Amino acid sequence: DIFRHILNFYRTGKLHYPRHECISAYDEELAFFGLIPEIIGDCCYEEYKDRRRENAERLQDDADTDTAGESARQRVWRAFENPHTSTMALVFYYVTGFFIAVSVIANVVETVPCGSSPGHIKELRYAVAFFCLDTACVMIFTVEYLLRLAAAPSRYRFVRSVMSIIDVVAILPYYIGLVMTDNEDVSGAFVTLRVFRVFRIFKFSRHSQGLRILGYTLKSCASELGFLLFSLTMAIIIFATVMFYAEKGSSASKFTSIPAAFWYTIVTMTTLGYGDMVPKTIAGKIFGSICSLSGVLVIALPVPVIVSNFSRIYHQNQRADKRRAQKKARLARIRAAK
Amino acid sequence: DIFRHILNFYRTGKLHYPRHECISAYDEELAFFGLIPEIIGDCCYEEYKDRRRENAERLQDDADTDTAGTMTARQRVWRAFENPHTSTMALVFYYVTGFFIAVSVIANVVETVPCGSSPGHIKELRYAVAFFCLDTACVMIFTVEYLLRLAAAPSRYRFVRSVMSIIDVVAILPYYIGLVMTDNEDVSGAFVTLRVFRVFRIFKFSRHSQGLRILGYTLKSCASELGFLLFSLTMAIIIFATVMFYAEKGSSASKFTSIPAAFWYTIVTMTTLGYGDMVPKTIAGKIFGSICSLSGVLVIALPVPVIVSNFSRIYHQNQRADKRRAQKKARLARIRAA
Amino acid sequence: ATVMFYAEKGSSASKFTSIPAAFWYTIVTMTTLGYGDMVPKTIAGKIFGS
Amino acid sequence: FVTLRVFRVFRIFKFSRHSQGLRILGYTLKSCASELGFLLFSLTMAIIIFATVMFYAEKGSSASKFTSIPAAFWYTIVTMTTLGYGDMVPKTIAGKIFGSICSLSGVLVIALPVPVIVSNFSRIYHQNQRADKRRAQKKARLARIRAA
Amino acid sequence: DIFRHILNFYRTGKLHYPRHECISAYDEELAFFGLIPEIIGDCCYEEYKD
Numbered sequence: 001d002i003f004r005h006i007l008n009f010y011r012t013g014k015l016h017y018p019r020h021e022c023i024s025a026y027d028e029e030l031a032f033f034g035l036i037p038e039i040i041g042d043c044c045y046e047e048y049k050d051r052r053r054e055n056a057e058r059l060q061d062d063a064d065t066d067t068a069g070e071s072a073r074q075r076v077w078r079a080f081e082n083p084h085t086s087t088m089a090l091v092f093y094y095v096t097g098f099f100i101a102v103s104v105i106a107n108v109v110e111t112v113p114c115g116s117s118p119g120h121i122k123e124l125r126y127a128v129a130f131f132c133l134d135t136a137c138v139m140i141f142t143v144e145y146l147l148r149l150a151a152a153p154s155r156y157r158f159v160r161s162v163m164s165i166i167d168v169v170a171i172l173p174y175y176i177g178l179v180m181t182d183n184e185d186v187s188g189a190f191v192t193l194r195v196f197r198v199f200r201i202f203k204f205s206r207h208s209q210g211l212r213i214l215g216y217t218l219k220s221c222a223s224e225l226g227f228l229l230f231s232l233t234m235a236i237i238i239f240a241t242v243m244f245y246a247e248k249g250s251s252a253s254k255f256t257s258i259p260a261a262f263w264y265t266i267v268t269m270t271t272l273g274y275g276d277m278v279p280k281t282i283a284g285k286i287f288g289s290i291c292s293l294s295g296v297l298v299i300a301l302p303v304p305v306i307v308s309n310f311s312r313i314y315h316q317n318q319r320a321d322k323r324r325a326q327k328k329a330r331l332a333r334i335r336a337a338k
Numbered sequence: 339d340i341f342r343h344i345l346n347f348y349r350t351g352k353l354h355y356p357r358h359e360c361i362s363a364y365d366e367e368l369a370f371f372g373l374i375p376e377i378i379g380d381c382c383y384e385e386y387k388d389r390r391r392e393n394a395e396r397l398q399d400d401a402d403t404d405t406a407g408t409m410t411a412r413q414r415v416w417r418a419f420e421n422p423h424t425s426t427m428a429l430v431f432y433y434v435t436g437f438f439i440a441v442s443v444i445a446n447v448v449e450t451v452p453c454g455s456s457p458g459h460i461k462e463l464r465y466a467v468a469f470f471c472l473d474t475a476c477v478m479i480f481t482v483e484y485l486l487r488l489a490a491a492p493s494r495y496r497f498v499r500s501v502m503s504i505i506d507v508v509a510i511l512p513y514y515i516g517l518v519m520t521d522n523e524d525v526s527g528a529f530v531t532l533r534v535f536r537v538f539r540i541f542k543f544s545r546h547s548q549g550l551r552i553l554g555y556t557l558k559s560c561a562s563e564l565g566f567l568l569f570s571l572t573m574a575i576i577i578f579a580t581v582m583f584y585a586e587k588g589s590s591a592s593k594f595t596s597i598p599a600a601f602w603y604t605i606v607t608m609t610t611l612g613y614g615d616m617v618p619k620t621i622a623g624k625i626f627g628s629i630c631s632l633s634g635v636l637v638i639a640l641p642v643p644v645i646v647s648n649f650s651r652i653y654h655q656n657q658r659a660d661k662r663r664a665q666k667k668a669r670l671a672r673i674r675a676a
Numbered sequence: 677a678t679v680m681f682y683a684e685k686g687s688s689a690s691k692f693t694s695i696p697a698a699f700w701y702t703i704v705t706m707t708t709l710g711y712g713d714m715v716p717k718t719i720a721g722k723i724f725g726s
Numbered sequence: 727f728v729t730l731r732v733f734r735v736f737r738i739f740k741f742s743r744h745s746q747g748l749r750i751l752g753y754t755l756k757s758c759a760s761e762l763g764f765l766l767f768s769l770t771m772a773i774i775i776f777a778t779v780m781f782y783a784e785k786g787s788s789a790s791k792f793t794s795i796p797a798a799f800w801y802t803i804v805t806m807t808t809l810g811y812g813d814m815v816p817k818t819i820a821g822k823i824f825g826s827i828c829s830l831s832g833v834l835v836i837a838l839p840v841p842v843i844v845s846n847f848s849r850i851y852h853q854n855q856r857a858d859k860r861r862a863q864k865k866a867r868l869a870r871i872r873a874a
Numbered sequence: 875d876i877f878r879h880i881l882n883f884y885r886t887g888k889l890h891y892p893r894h895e896c897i898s899a900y901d902e903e904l905a906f907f908g909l910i911p912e913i914i915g916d917c918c919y920e921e922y923k924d
Contacts, residue, residue: 198580210566241735272612273809537678611710709810
């Protein structure tokens, strides 16, 4: 059947690719017959290249099936980074997740009125022991990183990873607070450091598969996110300027300056509508409605490609385990079926 | 045609499956030639695999023949009213109990308006407790069906294990618990809680609906997606609430008392609801509220298309199944007609 | 609406006078409209509103 | 003078040179003129109908803000877009029912042409990317066919 | 090409419908050859009807 295509090619000087003969059957024939794969039509060339690519993404994951087969601090590192190895890795995974959960819930509770300054002014409870808990969690986290400091086959390669930078930036706040307390006490960046303290949630990227795939999707669609941001800035600037210039004349209009118009426009384009700032002139109302419509449009512009990329990556990642299992079953079955 | 692929297999160590021809003839040829089916390439292998599970999916329900022609036993009339179209008694029972459920729910909703069950007259003569009687008039009837369901239950254990049965139990129980409590004198508190389940009584409508069962099926299938939705939503709530609260602790009349208030603000902002009860005041607060709104749009819209697609495909496959069952019955009728 | 009324009928001057008011609030919430006329004030109210 | 100052932000569209998304959006808006016109027509029809129903059901109240039909236009356009500022709100039972149905109908009307616009933009972007990628791949094909 | 499908049908007792031969070419052949259009497979019957 492919020889017929070669005959047609020699007849006309241009070759075409059968659609129902696939590529791993076409490639073998074109290699055996010695044909040139860069003269196969124009439209057929493109569709053949696309199909070659489509069948090409599955030649490396099956190659990556073996993963790591090396054993020893390397062996314990392999058991650690992949929890589904032994009881030890499961124990550390579970306990680390539990302690991250207790740290974040403690940070949440830190300002609960029963657990904070209010609720007791007439007589005095405000247990400061929260502090100690934080300390414990922090050092435990550092112990984690300490093994990551040693078990990593390459120090620089591990540090370059985003997981390492997240871990270290969540480690810093406790030590920075200790250093600040060591040298007197000044108001200011202490609340800011407490703000950075919340970033400890991100360790669940290890205790999940959805967080890392979501990060993958966001990193892949960076151009579309930038287009979102640019178009949104254009729209907010235009609509805020128009509404300010059509509403600055009023009794006590909340549109004091352009940034107030930014606030109103960004709460409108997102269809939020707090009601703090509303127009009072006809031009104000009409441009507010147009702004809401344009905000719906702008926000809905890139979400289809975002959700499509997320879905595609999720299908491939979730089916990785499935076709791995069925290849394993086929491999077990084949050598006894001959 | 298939002999060509067979000869291609005997040419090398690999075989390929064309995408157009049906799988049935191909597996028939594989069986007749004595060829193993786990040797048909790798890409073509998985393509054949998905085609074969697709064609087995349309074949598993093809055996819907046991539902053919109060004639055999008690279980026979049980199955007769299980399908509310077999007999006149089944349909009348189904629709009449649907009307009873509807009137029960109407009584439940109307028992609080200040014209029929609350004093709209401080000194005049209505607050009829007849709803109770009506309620009892419903409750007894309700219990009836459950006993009827247990009158001819083919498997008591499996039927009790069913979600439909436990829904029925949770629907009928609260009145029994309330009357037992009244038999053991009246205490304020959980009485409103027992009254709440009077609207969980609604799920009896799942019999009188096809969409509800499909929604339950797709929610059961998409448990992982819902769990990831919950996890990512909680993470976003915590992060944005902490950032908002720590940036709004001090103001003239700040409503951000503590972290739970920031949870309320973050969940009314990400859902694009925007009640306006608590609003940001500082520039950092406004910026972080805006980014919270956009991120909430993203997070909410991440799993919703997945849920929607799963529901749509389940509905479509159900419709395809019933339509092809009807068409195969018609095919049998016309093949016996000539 | 029933859940929010039974979790919010106890308040100082709660606008949830009767179940139809809870219908109004619920239908302005499920549509993500949020006029702000009626808002919960108890923890159960807030969680069930979300 | 303020009107002349306004166009200082219409000056922004000079960024269309420094952007590919803006040109694609312009192309798809030009292609989908009929869809946008039907959007406008159906939206105006819904505005008129729901505003009339709301206003005629809310003329008389203690402190009703529905002074006239344009106020009902404002309410209908803040309700259909699921914005809900809260400046003017229904008070009567018929008013609440019609506000609810207005909100649902506005969701429907807004979501009718938006997927069409989105699909047209996506297909235009995809065909542009396919065109430039295949131009690059045919240049590479020429380079390798001259290499041997 | 459709005669080959008829041959396979007589070989096995069950007929299948080619996917690239369309229907207004399949219908004429099945009418000229007098085949029964209600024995053409099970999955193939459904896809042919669609």
